[PDB]
Design a protein around this nucleic acid. Sequence first.
RNA 1: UAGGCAGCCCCAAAAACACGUGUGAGGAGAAAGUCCCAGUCACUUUGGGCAAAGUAGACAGCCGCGCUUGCGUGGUGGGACUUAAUUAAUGCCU
RNA 2: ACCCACUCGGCACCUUACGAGAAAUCAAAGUCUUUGGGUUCUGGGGGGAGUAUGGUCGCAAGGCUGAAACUUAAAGGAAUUGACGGAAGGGCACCACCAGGAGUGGAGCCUGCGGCUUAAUUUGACUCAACACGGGGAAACUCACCAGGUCCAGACACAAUAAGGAUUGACAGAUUGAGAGCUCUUUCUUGAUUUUGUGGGUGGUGGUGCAUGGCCGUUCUUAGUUGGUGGAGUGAUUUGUCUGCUUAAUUGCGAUAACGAACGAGACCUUAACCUACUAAAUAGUGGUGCUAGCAUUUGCUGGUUAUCCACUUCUUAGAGGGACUAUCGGUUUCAAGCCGAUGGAAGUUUGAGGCAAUAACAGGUCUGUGAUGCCCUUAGACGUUCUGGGCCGCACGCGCGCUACACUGACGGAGCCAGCGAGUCUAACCUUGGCCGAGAGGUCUUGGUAAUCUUGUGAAACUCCGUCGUGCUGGGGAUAGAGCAUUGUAAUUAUUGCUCUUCAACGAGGAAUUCCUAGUAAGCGCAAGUCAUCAGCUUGCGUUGAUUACGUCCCUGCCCUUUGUACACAC
Lengths: 65, 75
Amino acid sequence: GQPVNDFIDTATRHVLMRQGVLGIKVKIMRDPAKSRTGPKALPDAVTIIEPKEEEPILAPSVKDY
Amino acid sequence: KKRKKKVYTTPKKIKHKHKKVKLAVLSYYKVDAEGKVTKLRRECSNPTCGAGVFLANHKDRLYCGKCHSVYKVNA
RNA sequence: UAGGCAGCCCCAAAAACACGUGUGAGGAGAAAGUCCCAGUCACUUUGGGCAAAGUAGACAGCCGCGCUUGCGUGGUGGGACUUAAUUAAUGCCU
RNA sequence: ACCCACUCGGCACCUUACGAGAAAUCAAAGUCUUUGGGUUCUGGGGGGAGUAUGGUCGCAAGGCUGAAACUUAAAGGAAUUGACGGAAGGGCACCACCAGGAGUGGAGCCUGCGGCUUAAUUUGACUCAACACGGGGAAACUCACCAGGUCCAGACACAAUAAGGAUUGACAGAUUGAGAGCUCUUUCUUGAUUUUGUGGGUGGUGGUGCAUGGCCGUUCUUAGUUGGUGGAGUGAUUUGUCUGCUUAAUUGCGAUAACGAACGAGACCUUAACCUACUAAAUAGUGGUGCUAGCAUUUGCUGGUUAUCCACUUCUUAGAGGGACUAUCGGUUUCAAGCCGAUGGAAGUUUGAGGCAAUAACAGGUCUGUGAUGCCCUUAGACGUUCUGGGCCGCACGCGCGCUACACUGACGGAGCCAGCGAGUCUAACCUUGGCCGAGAGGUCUUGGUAAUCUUGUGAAACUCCGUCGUGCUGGGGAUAGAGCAUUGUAAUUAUUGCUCUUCAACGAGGAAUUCCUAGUAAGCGCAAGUCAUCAGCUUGCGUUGAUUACGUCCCUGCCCUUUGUACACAC
Ligand SMILES: [Mg+2]
Ligand SMILES: [Mg+2]
Ligand SMILES: [Mg+2]
Ligand SMILES: [Mg+2]
Ligand SMILES: [Mg+2]
Ligand SMILES: [Mg+2]
Ligand SMILES: [Mg+2]
Ligand SMILES: [Mg+2]
Ligand SMILES: [Mg+2]
Ligand SMILES: [Mg+2]
Ligand SMILES: [Mg+2]
Ligand SMILES: [Mg+2]
Ligand SMILES: [Mg+2]
Ligand SMILES: [Mg+2]
Ligand SMILES: [Mg+2]
Ligand SMILES: [Mg+2]
Ligand SMILES: [Mg+2]
């Protein structure tokens, strides 16, 4: 998926040796929260913000300015 | 595939070797007692060859060898 | 004529024994269908081998002929006996 | 006789692991390194071998007793994982089936491959996963095949050649396909710029893909793969990762010594479908008309513009967005996951379609895509390169992908006549309008377009209508061949191709068999693009017309999982 283009760089390289050619591949996924250009998280990383529970009131206690 | 052997129906050819000759002055320069030497053969009469090339004589006609020009002995 | 557009014309109804029109011992020319079939070589079937089946395929052999010793010139497929061929399988190794 | 509660003796059985064992398992196989109740028999790695001999018993068959020489590093037991099974069970999939549709296989031709001939008809790939594949429709080139002719484009170092000159290059005639001084008659010239030998390098569509990389195909477009803590086992290992239901899915619901997670899947991205809501626009249009004119006539159809007008972005385009989430209702199901129907909605098949796509692998393909490559070969009369010619297309034969037809749902003639995807030349001759010539292809002078501007509105075919034919191998069919007319190309010869006439081949719905396919899909039809100077019967995309059939199953095939068996583990 497109997260491989957003967060992953891929390299392939031939190395010459006296026995033959060797194929080396390096795949690196850097942190998605450090992207700072476009996407901020993974597409399925759904974080719900805290409810911020509040102590319920009983009396009206009208306030005026 | 692998290549087969090559046996030609014609014999081997040889390359041109230039005749190493021990003459450059006797062919064109005539011996004189005093030392006034005349030339025995013409030069490039083309405008852009020069006047010291001492062209190739033959039995019937003249060829340069260098300046490409063709002339006549009976001139 | 049952019907159809229907008076023509047009398209379309109606069975059984002859031991029978499927013989003889029938003889002969030309070719087809098959258990058993073919000498070597090729391939086709197989992942690949063999064992079996197949191919109008090359050499054969065989049948002969030519003026022959050497050879060439033609076919180079021929056999035997049955009321509609049925294919049950992987048949065995690497 | 039966019921209940006891008891002694017995055949067994169920749970557990006190305890044992290598484990399977075992109330004995327990009370064993914390080792001793009594007693009998038997074994000392595997073969040779229960063989030879001797004895003894037997009518015999044979029984009992019973070696050695020699030979070997394992043989064997239990259990685990995988693989396989002509074992069982459960799932899935138009590269499977059902029901159907179109076919192919039948006929002629195009093309690929095998076979044959040749000096060469170059090779690679042979089940799916080779056979219109090497994006390979090759006249030169492609070429690596063959036959001929040159050139080195043989670096660099050393030793000579020797400047009384190492050697390159030569018109002319012969030779040569050759207007190659290739070489022969010849002397002209360039002038450490060369030549020879060695070392060494280089070129090589030369070999080795079973030495290799990369890439691609396949398992697998399926749904599978892991570890953390805990549980089980001495251990390899197992559970988690599952009976069941559900899903495209290890998708979830649940069950539950498992609980919570990661990769894959999904999510994601691109494209298509909607938006009278935003932004706009002479490279896109629309309406009145600033302007004007035509015809029919009292306004319809238009022809010409944006300083030869204004307004607008519905249609057109691309930026930001919204919209679908299976939404509301009903039924059914563990009232769960879901599934189905109706309503609504542009969209209710993962909304349609693709891109990326897990772990582990294949002696899968390519050395001939690579100046990716180890090794090997060749390196000069070259297996290097170039020039000429031919070939890859050769034809007793076989198979596959294909096109054209067997006709009236038709063939031919006339008329109407709509797309969409795209491509474009001075980075030289590209897409072509218009005018003219020519039956035709084609030719001439130009024009517009480097591109939403022109081709182009690609005025496409199929199709709709009207005629000719009237069931006739016929006006269905166009195989083959002859003559000419033109294009592209140095070259059309083996006919590149187009065009006019003439011949009208087989084919009369095609066997065993075999392919693809569930919706704007199959199929019909045409169009654009790859290759290309030309040539498509091929391929990649596009649009027009647009079905029938079923919403299922494991019958066949293939794949997966579970149990099971194994003397397999290179794994049938
Ligand atoms: Mg008992
Ligand atoms: Mg012992
Ligand atoms: Mg022993
Ligand atoms: Mg099939
Ligand atoms: Mg069917
Ligand atoms: Mg057919
Ligand atoms: Mg055929
Ligand atoms: Mg070649
Ligand atoms: Mg040379
Ligand atoms: Mg553990
Ligand atoms: Mg596991
Ligand atoms: Mg995905
Ligand atoms: Mg070919
Ligand atoms: Mg259009
Ligand atoms: Mg005709
Ligand atoms: Mg004619
Ligand atoms: Mg058994």
